[PDB]
Structure formats: structure tokens, C-alpha cells
Amino acid sequence: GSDPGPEAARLRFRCFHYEEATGPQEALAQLRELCRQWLRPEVRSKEQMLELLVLEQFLGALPPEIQARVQGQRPGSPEEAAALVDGLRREPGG
Amino acid sequence: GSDPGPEAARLRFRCFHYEEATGPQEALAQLRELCRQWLRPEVRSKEQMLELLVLEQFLGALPPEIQARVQGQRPGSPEEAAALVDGLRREPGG
Asked: Which CATH number applies to A1-94?
């Protein structure tokens, strides 16, 4: 009755390495499946998908060191990530 | 006057570098806007967002060299990307 969580599902979604062995189209079927367990059109609407995806680019837009700090906590929401980094940009050392 | 288009919107969205000077939450506002110009709940539905976002991760799941090729052409559709990468992996490099 519990769900893994959208953030956990997204982690699995990105933990997926592109493997030529399964073929890119078949890999898509995996990614599509994994992203679907994260986005979930069934329960989430389009604007919520925006939020999740904003977070997505935002994290990778961060420098490796700041990004690692996020990745070491995993907020799952863009503004939370923003708040993590908001302090990290205040002279690296926190 | 028009929208950049979902394909170009993702470009602007991915070309966005995190700049501490604009702040993460202000950057979010830009990203939230850019991703919205890409996903567009206004015109598109959730499953379209699934697809666009599968593409997004699929490209990053690819190795830097293969990813660079996709990034240089920009299909915008996951299966289309799957098609070039399937070719790029034919005799690693093409």
C-alpha cells in the first residue's frame, strides 16, 4: 500500500545505464517505465511534471561539487534543492 | 511573436548553466518557464511529457561521445534518438 516515491523512482531512472545490449529502443521501454513510476500521469498532473523536470536540469546545471552536495541528500523538489544550494553558494565550505 | 518550440525550448533549458549570481530559485523560475515552453501543459498532455522526459534521460544515459552526436543533431524524440545511437554503436563510432 506504500509507494517507493517519485524521487526514488527517478533515481532508479537515472541509475539506468545506457546499455547497448538491450538496444536503445528497449532501453526506452525501461526508461519510459521508470520515468512513468516517477511522473505518474495517473496521479500527477502536467504542472507537477514541470516541477520534477525543473529539478532535473537544475541539479545537473549545478557544478559537480554543489551537485554532489544535493545528491548526497536528495531533496526531490527544485526549491528544496535551491535551498540546499542557496547556502552552498555562500562561500564553498558548508 | 511565438514560442521557441519544444525542441528549441529544451535547448535553452539544457544550455542553461547554473549561475549563483542569478540565484537557484530565480534560475528555477527561468527553468520552470523554459521547461514549460518545452513540455507545455497548455497544449500537451502528461504522456507527451513522459516521452519528452524519457528522451531527456536517454540522452544523458548515453556515453559523452554518443551523446555529443545526438546533441549535435537534436531529434527531440526518444525513439528517433534511439535510432541514431543504434547506428553510432555500430562499430563504436559509426
From this structure: 1.10.4020.10
